[PDB]
């Protein structure tokens, strides 16, 4: 029997530095998890040990924090080659730059094979980027020899920023090919690895033949056998086994997200690459490993020009920006206007005839907020500034909510109002009145909303039936603050930028800003 | 006796091509006035008769039309020399770009002594500037020299952006020293051109000795002995005599704006520099007059950049913008809105401790709002687009008016509410409710508006004895579409720049805009 080792992280989302328990800035150092330096050393330790090892990434390195913002990939090909990737599938946030944000920074720079056969392209593109990622992969292992077949999540062109000349198919019609193509070069032994999130993985070890693992992404699924290491809830065991539809057991794997977990499988095969069998479990990356102190003083080189980037102006205020607790808990701050209207800001995608943009609406708890910004120190804003307001490393992310949703939301938001609660909602896009002499549960009195389909924006009733694109924080779409019925009830989520970044994107946009309290929230 | 011809432009405001009969666009060539080609076939006529002639202009050449636009000051530059001016003052808009956006376009390409004797420099800016205007020029004229001393409005640091490097002096003070130093030369004939108004003119031809004649400008003043000859009604004689408190009888002309007239006084001197007597009139600029050909092919090559950036992308709309009379005319419109956000965006001026911003309040009247913009054009806005909606050629202007005036003007908007007339107004800044069952005359029945003096803007009720800093179209400022109570009423007028290139700024700077309808009016 050959014995595979598999290694894999997916969504590490620019965790390049060691995190939090949550996945946060990294603050008490003995409670820390995660990074590359301390990956860096699972790794090499695990490759001294056992004879046959592959190290793979199944995307979403793109997006996250301050890393990305300056380095734009480039921290990427820079730190998995120097962890030695075997192979990495595109994600969704590997567009977020665009193409061109892909192909430099990380297609020309990746010491690793790049996969996904699923995406292809053409006009003037199919010749800028042909051989630039792959299908799949034929990858020398000790003696023998592993192919590795790439997916995209084919949601992508709604989610990120691929631009028109990438169609994404579907996955289970693209793989087929593939692997039957990989069977005719004498692979027996075949990992499909790609980023279309745990339904899609299941689907893919159900339904295409020759698969012998899949190794996923994308839904941050957390899988363990036995008791939970740490504080994420599995959602299954790991392996999770597929029963296929030529009724072999396959193994699907995901190891959560944000490099707090290096997935770790092991599966037996047989002369012709059948699994005899196969058993792991993600393994947790905490502070009794070392980091790598030559990663380490990598990482620390790096980080000088995020210091630097961090204490530039990105643009100017001329109001005070009220993020005090007295105001933000209390009623509309134009503090919360300016984070809304950021939100909304980013990600524009029109379609004529069809929507001015596909979100008109946010909400932001007042309790997220957690200082004002000065405008007299000549205005400036400066990234530093905005981590003092939005401190948690969350995203703003989009979810789909019923009218119904919504209205219990702003109920929930003033349920016992006037305690200074983190729950009271600020807001874009939104008109609301409360009289708050009602019974809680009955104190929104009037809830407006911006249309989406209509060519010129305007505010209508919000209807209990419709379903509404609302950008908020992770936070919320999670169901912090109590409003669990943002959790249990939404249709979708997808997961978006960092907090500060998409806030210092909109500022440097808008060079000057001057955010008012004007009336989206009032109290009959 | 000597006999002196001085011909004098002011506030041409970069009407460089020939114009209608109220200073706009030239739309049909037999009723057109003024530009460069025009006014040079006058002089050359004026220069061949004469003996001795000095062409003097009085500053605001900067800002008005898309010629400054695109060309910078570098037009006023080429088009000045070509007429061979003699001298000319600083204006106001002639630090509109800065004191960069002066000495580079015209300080350092003018082939005429640039003047100003009451505008000071320090800091490294001194050594920038030093000598690239002057406080006064000796000039030949025939076989005599005549002193020609400028001066700028004290004011243009609250107008304009001359920066903190520069400080501007009461003019009477600045100027009797200079003019006490040309007495030192044996210069006896002493002319003060300048740029502070015909109020400012005629202290200064009273109260500074010396000072022989003042021709001046920024006050627009039309001066007429006689039958006027086309629609200005004049504000006095030409010239107006001033009694000076040393007892001579000083003139002080000023010929209107927009390069509709050439000012043109003769002065006869004894041997002393004594005016014996000085008489004349300006010059209207009408078609009997031929447009010089060689100046107007030059213009015509000139207008080639122009046409072009005309049709450039200024930026993008994701909404469709709607200006058309059945929106604009009868409720909140979102081309009126976008105007008035583009008004306010425009020239921010903030002071720590005292103003967010110097003005938060914007007014339009439907009327003057021509078109919509369509945003199917892949959201593509042009200069071109833009003069559809705007195509009167004119300016949005700040005004000072009473609470109690401008809820007159709000009256006025609705007074016959219902018969699509251009009087109702759009607006930014201000929350306006009316109650059409009421009255004429007693139709709002709520009135807030944005705070100034307040670091964090909100919207307090209108008070009827406070003063507003509000800006809106120079049309309104003057009374037109029956505002009768605004140009009554009003406490102070400034000229700002011209319509739609206080747009076009706004949409540059935004790059994607996606003004809503969003109860800034209301009808109870
Ligand atoms: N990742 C997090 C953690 C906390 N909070 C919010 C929830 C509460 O509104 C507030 C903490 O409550 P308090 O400030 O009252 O301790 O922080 C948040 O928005 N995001
Ligand atoms: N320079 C001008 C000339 C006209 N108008 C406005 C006044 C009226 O509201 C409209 C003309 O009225 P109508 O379109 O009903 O002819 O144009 C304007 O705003 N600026
Ligand atoms: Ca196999
Ligand atoms: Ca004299
Ligand atoms: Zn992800
Ligand atoms: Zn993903
Ligand atoms: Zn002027
Ligand atoms: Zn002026």
Chains 1, 2 share one sequence.
């Not at 290096?262 to 058993?279: C, Q």
Request: proline content about 5%; charged content about 25%; hydrophobic content about 35%.
């Amino acid at each position: 029997p050959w014995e595979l080792t598999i290694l894999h992280t997916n969504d590490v989302h620019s965790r390049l530095e060691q995190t939090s328990e949550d996945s946060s800035k990294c603050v008490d150092a003995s409670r820390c998890m995660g990074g590359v330096a301390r990956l860096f050393t699972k790794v090499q330790q695990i490759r001294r040990a056992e004879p046959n090892v592959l190290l793979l990434d199944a995307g979403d390195q793109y997006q996250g924090t301050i890393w990305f913002t300056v380095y734009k990939g480039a921290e990427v090909a820079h730190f998995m080659n120097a962890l030695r990737y075997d192979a990495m599938a595109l994600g969704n946030h590997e567009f977020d730059n665009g193409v061109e944000g892909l192909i430099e920074p990380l297609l020309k720079e990746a010491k690793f094979p790049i996969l996904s056969a699923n995406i292809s392209a053409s006009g003037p593109l199919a010749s800028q980027i042909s051989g630039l990622y792959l299908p799949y992969k034929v990858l020398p292992v000790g003696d023998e020899v592993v192919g590795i077949v790439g997916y995209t999540s084919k949601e992508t062109p709604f989610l990120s920023n691929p631009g028109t000349n990438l169609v994404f198919e579907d996955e289970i019609t693209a793989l087929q090919p593939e692997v039957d193509k990989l069977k005719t070069l004498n692979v027996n032994k075949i990992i499909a690895l790609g980023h279309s999130g745990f339904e899609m993985d299941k689907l893919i070890a159900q339904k295409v033949r020759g698969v012998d693992v899949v190794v996923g992404g994308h839904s941050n699924t957390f899988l363990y056998t036995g008791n939970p290491p740490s504080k994420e809830v599995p959602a299954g065991k790991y392996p999770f086994i597929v029963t296929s539809d030529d009724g072999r057991k396959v193994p699907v794997v995901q190891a959560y997200a944000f490099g707090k977990y290096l997935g770790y499988l092991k599966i037996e095969f047989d002369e012709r690459g059948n699994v005899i069998s196969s058993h792991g479990n993600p393994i947790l990356l905490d502070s009794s490993i070392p980091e790598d102190p030559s990663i380490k003083a990598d990482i620390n080189k790096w980080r000088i020009k995020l210091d630097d980037y961090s204490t530039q102006e990105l643009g100017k205020t001329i109001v005070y920006l009220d993020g005090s607790s007295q105001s933000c808990r209390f009623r509309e701050c134009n503090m919360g206007n300016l984070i809304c209207d950021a939100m909304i800001n980013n990600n524009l995608r029109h379609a004529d005839e069809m929507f001015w943009n596909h979100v008109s609406m946010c909400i932001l708890n007042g309790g997220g907020i957690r200082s004002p910004i000065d405008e007299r120190n000549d205005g400036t804003i400066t990234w530093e500034n905005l981590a003092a307001v939005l401190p948690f490393g969350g995203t703003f992310d989009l979810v789909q909510l019923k009218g119904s949703t919504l209205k219990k939301a702003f109920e929930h938001s003033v349920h016992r109002y006037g305690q200074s609660t983190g729950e009271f909602l600020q807001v874009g896009g939104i008109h609301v009145v409360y009289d708050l002499s009602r019974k809680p549960g009955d104190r929104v009195v009037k809830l407006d909303v911006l249309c989406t389909s209509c060519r010129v924006p305007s505010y209508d009733p919000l209807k209990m039936d419709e379903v509404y694109k609302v950008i908020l924080p992770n936070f919320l779409a999670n169901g912090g603050d109590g409003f669990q019925m943002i959790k249990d009830e939404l249709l979708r989520h997808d997961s978006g930028d960092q907090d500060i970044n998409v806030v210092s994107t909109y500022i440097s946009k808008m060079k000057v800003i001057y955010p008012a309290v004007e009336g989206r929230i009032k109290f009959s």
